């Protein structure tokens, strides 16, 4: 037990490598080269602070975020919070589900429907682990993170990127209205609200404590786990950018956000082996982030309302929007706009209570978050909310 909270940290980090980030990072590389690497880095650092504040809420108060809302806020407001939190968990799981089904299509050739059934069944077995023991799930998610990191490591060696061109991409410079829009879309759609509630419960009561000094030691050993777990997610997101830029930018490639076109152009440029590592890495990202999304939903309802439904019933409900899109044949860009609108709704409603309760001695006791870290959480919050509000102005304006 050298790293006590490494499990919850790896569980929370997988939501920031979901297939939603694959489509964004690839599109940024082909259209603008490496010149967007600074945006990927900026979004990852902001996601480390928010996820660290959730884990501390559970360690200090001995209670998770949905529990404290039920206990302190009025019943009319609590019922609304449970409602919107379920809708966001279903919105973010849609992209994690469809991505896991697309990777199977690139590796085997199966249609999107049968790919979704394969991912639906394997996600059962992942949450089947955490039923009796929560540690087997922490080992499984960690194993999937090992494959995505190794797969994109070989793609960098094969792509042979110009280091001088990669370095110039970390300079915050943007040209043309297209590149600016794509950067705003990264920072606006990065933080995962469903994993904000979940991280608090995973660390809540993980180590029994009778004093306040042993809880404080748990906070220090937890931060290293979050930084290491969230840090690895950032380097992976930058690898997707570099490979797409080192191969597609100078060759005039259109429709880069679609993971199918990016998969086909890797063979004549890099080779057939470069395409396999891409799809294998996309598969481990999808089903891992989908199984975490279900465990978050169970915590949301159990804390907000006191009762809970079985896990198999929760997995069944969240799969419903996934199969509907497959049957209707919706545009991949159309589903990323509607799902992010709901994600743009859940972000403000999640960051506000997290920044309030982690700052109240009534909740945290002698482990209140430093006010210097509370203001920066609000500054990061206003930046994200404003960008989301702007993204809603064009998404709801047409
Ligand atoms: C590692 C896991 C399986 C081996 C990967 C090899 C099996 C699939 C690799 C070849 C591939 O991905 O292309 C298949 C084709 O595109 C279909 O339409
Ligand atoms: C990845 C989840 C499994 C952990 C590593 C596998 C080694 C077996 C572990 C415990 C013995 C229980 C054996 C039966 C396995 C039931 C839990 C799955
Ligand atoms: C290849 C298609 C599958 C998609 C996921 C890619 C690999 C994910 C990593 C480990 C999976 C299980 C290994 C568990 C760790 C070793 C246990 C013995
Ligand atoms: C900018 C508006 C957000 C300002 C925070 C509102 C607030 O209530 O501050 C939290 C404080 O810790 C307790 O009241
Ligand atoms: C000292 C930390 C205060 C941070 C300065 C910003 C506090 C403004 C604010 O709204 O906080 C309301 C609270 O009641 C009062 O700090
Ligand atoms: C960007 C500024 C983020 C840092 C803001 C530093 C000022 C924080 C503040 O106003 O109150 C903190 C208090 O003085 C001590 O914890
Ligand atoms: C753009 C910036 C918006 C204001 C962001 C900071 C406003 C909210 C921070 C004040 C706060 O709530 O933290 C201090 C707390 O009230 C006691 O220390
Ligand atoms: C009160 C609402 C805020 C006012 C507007 C928000 C600031 C600019 C945002 C979008 C403008 C179009 C994209 C930026 C182009 C500005 C230069 C032309
Ligand atoms: Mn994500
Ligand atoms: Mn160029």
Author numbering: 39 to 436
Reported in the publication:
We also determined high-resolution DraNramp structures in metal-free occluded (WT) and Mn2+-bound inward-open (M230A•Mn2+) states and re-refined a Mn2+-bound outward-open conformation (G223W•Mn2+). Re-refined G223W•Mn2+ has six Mn2+-coordinating ligands: D56, N59, M230, carbonyl of A53 and two waters; the overall geometry resembles a distorted octahedron as in the occluded structure. A227 replaces a water of the outward-open Mn2+-coordination sphere, thus retaining a six-coordination geometry in both conformations. In the occluded and inward-open conformations, Q378 interacts with two waters, one coordinating the orthosteric Mn2+ and the other interacting with D56 and the carbonyl of T130. This network is disrupted in the outward-open conformation as Q378 and the rest of TM10 swing outward to open the outer vestibule. In the second network, T228, N275, and N82 interact via a water in the occluded and inward-open states, but not in the outward-open state, where the extended unwound region of TM6a positions T228 farther from the orthosteric site and N275 and N82. A metal ion is present at the external site in all inward-open and occluded metal-bound DraNramp structures, but not outward-open structures, as opening the outer vestibule separates D296 and D369 and disrupts the site. The ITC data for G223W with Mn2+ fits only in a one-site model (Kd=440±15 µM), which we assign to the orthosteric site because the opening of the outer vestibule displaces TM10, disrupting the external site. Mn2+ binds at the orthosteric site in G223W, but Cd2+ binding is impaired.
Transporters of the Nramp (Natural resistance-associated macrophage protein) family import divalent transition metal ions into cells of most organisms. In addition to the physiological substrates Fe2+ and Mn2+, Nramps can also transport toxic metals like Cd2+ and Hg2+ but exclude the abundant alkaline earth metals like Mg2+ and Ca2+. Recent bacterial Nramp structures reveal a LeuT fold, three stable conformations (outward-open, occluded, and inward-open), and identify the metal-binding site residues, including conserved aspartate, asparagine, and methionine residues. We present high-resolution structures of DraNramp in three conformations in both Mn2+-bound and metal-free states, providing the first molecular map of the entire Mn2+ transport cycle.
